[PDB]
Amino acid sequence: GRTVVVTTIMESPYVMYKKNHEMFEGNDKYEGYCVDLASEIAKHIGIKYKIAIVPDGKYGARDADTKIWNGMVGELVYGKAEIAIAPLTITLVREEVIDFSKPFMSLGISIMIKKGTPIESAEDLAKQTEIAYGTLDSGSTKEFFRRSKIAVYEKMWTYMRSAEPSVFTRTTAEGVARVRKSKGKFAFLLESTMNEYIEQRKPCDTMKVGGNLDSKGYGVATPKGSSLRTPVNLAVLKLSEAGVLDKLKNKWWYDGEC
Amino acid sequence: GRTVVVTTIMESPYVMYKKNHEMFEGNDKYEGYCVDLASEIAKHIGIKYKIAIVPDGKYGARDADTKIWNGMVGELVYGKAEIAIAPLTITLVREEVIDFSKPFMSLGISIMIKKGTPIESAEDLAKQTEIAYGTLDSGSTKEFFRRSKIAVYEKMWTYMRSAEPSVFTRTTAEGVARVRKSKGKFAFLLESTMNEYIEQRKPCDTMKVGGNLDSKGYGVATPKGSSLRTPVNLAVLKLSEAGVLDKLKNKWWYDKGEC
Ligand SMILES: Cc1onc(O)c1C[C@H](N)C(=O)O
Ligand SMILES: Cc1onc(O)c1C[C@H](N)C(=O)O
């Protein structure tokens, strides 16, 4: 049939450029967990597809002033893509406007610090003001803190909401770079999958501290009314039960540069 | 509105009889994680309901001979209930015949042994014949071994399917009893949630060994075409993000240090 448009995002090790990607066309320019997942799903449900990187580089939330959805979620809602295959977190606010498959990977919000930083936990962050901390803007992590009725997270939100200059970044890379270049005066709140990948690679100057703040999952997303909803959901469960999801995780998170 | 029939199963600490249960009527006879979850869901989607314990006491599988679904799955498929709220595992074969909400709890298949048993892993079980081992009948754990293409689990399946006496069990309670009564000559394959709960309570003679064999979840189930599907799904995610599922898990699994 038609070539299905798959929206995704540049985020290591989910979607990355190959070395010498310039020598490849279309999908063959990319590699990573979600590139592999797309291939596996497409094989199961029998579709041709084209990876399209989300133009605004965002995951998906409502613009504060217009309320229009941005990022990958927006691409699905407004007709520009037919499937999102990415580290896109399954949340209520998103499930109300798009459909998610059952989860293909588990994660939680976690704390990234530069090695040496005097911080062991969220409580440690919330106590003080010397070390600044923040999250991605326009995503599930920022929403977690704004929503929370837990004392420590409420305190963290009240700080982050009003901090100057902004503690919110547009990409995870931006947050991680800030951690590395701030000499221990910045901690970044990001999902455990990313945190753990990054701490096992050069320059080996960051680490995850404490446990995860919550527990949830990533899912493959389709626009409401899509004929791909059920096929995609069953495909994810098939891959789960055949051990393929586990195999791909071990492949892309394999450790020992550090 | 109507009183919705909720199918569930007696399984501690998801669904248990209250002390002096004969002194209570209807829903008030029960307590547990899934009883609380049922109340929270009904409240968020605005329904009245009646808890009805699954008559055959099974989770649910498609009978090989008759091709008829049993357990809670069957109750939904054949119109005997409208929602299943229980530690029912989300699987491909079940998803083909009923709908599941996003997961409310994570788990994996695990190994239960009697303390002292010389077993530390699935591989240990497989390369050995002295100690027997099996699973529940009529659920996801048995199907896992039946379907596995992994060497170690295939070997385990070939043994179990022909073992004598039969190693398959009716309820987790009976599996746990067989582990306790077999003085170390039986190991029981059950999900981590049950394994961990049982390990921390008297008589404190069992334990989980090794990591989980897989990673999956439980979901709330509804029959295909149900008008309750979406409200149920949104309620589970709302409860999750509100910290309520966390609160319930820590309440019902709280370790009072009996061991
Ligand atoms: C990936 C990642 O890592 N940390 C985050 O906040 C994210 C984005 C998050 N998964 C979202 O869907 O908004
Ligand atoms: C609960 C439980 O604990 N171990 C098991 O195998 C089960 C049953 C399993 N959750 C099912 O849905 O079949």
Structural account:
2 copies of one chain form a homodimer. Chain A is α/β, with parallel strands linked by helices. Chain A has 2 domains: 2-107 and 217-255, D-Maltodextrin-Binding Protein, domain 2 (3-Layer(aba) Sandwich); 108-216, D-Maltodextrin-Binding Protein, domain 2 (3-Layer(aba) Sandwich), CATH 3.40.190. Chain A is 35% helix and 19% strand. Chain A has helices spanning 33-45, 71-77, 92-95, 122-127, 140-147, 151-162, 172-181, 192-199, 229-241, 244-253; strands at residues 3-8, 16-17, 30-31, 48-53, 83-84, 98-100, 105-107, 109-114, 132-135, 186-191, 206-209, 216-218, 221-223. In chain A, strands 9-10-8-11 form a 4-stranded mixed sheet. In chain A, strands 4-1-5 form a 3-stranded parallel sheet, with helices on both faces. Chain A is globular, with a radius of gyration of 18 Å. The interface between A and B is medium-sized, with 26 and 25 residues. The complex binds (S)-alpha-amino-3-hydroxy-5-methyl-4-isoxazolepropionic acid (AMQ) (2 copies). The PDB classes it as membrane protein. The entry lists the keywords ionotropic glutamate receptors, iGluR4, flip, ligand-binding core, agonist complex, membrane protein. It forms a dimeric assembly. X-ray structure of iGluR4 flip ligand-binding core (S1S2) in complex with (S)-AMPA at 1.90A resolution.
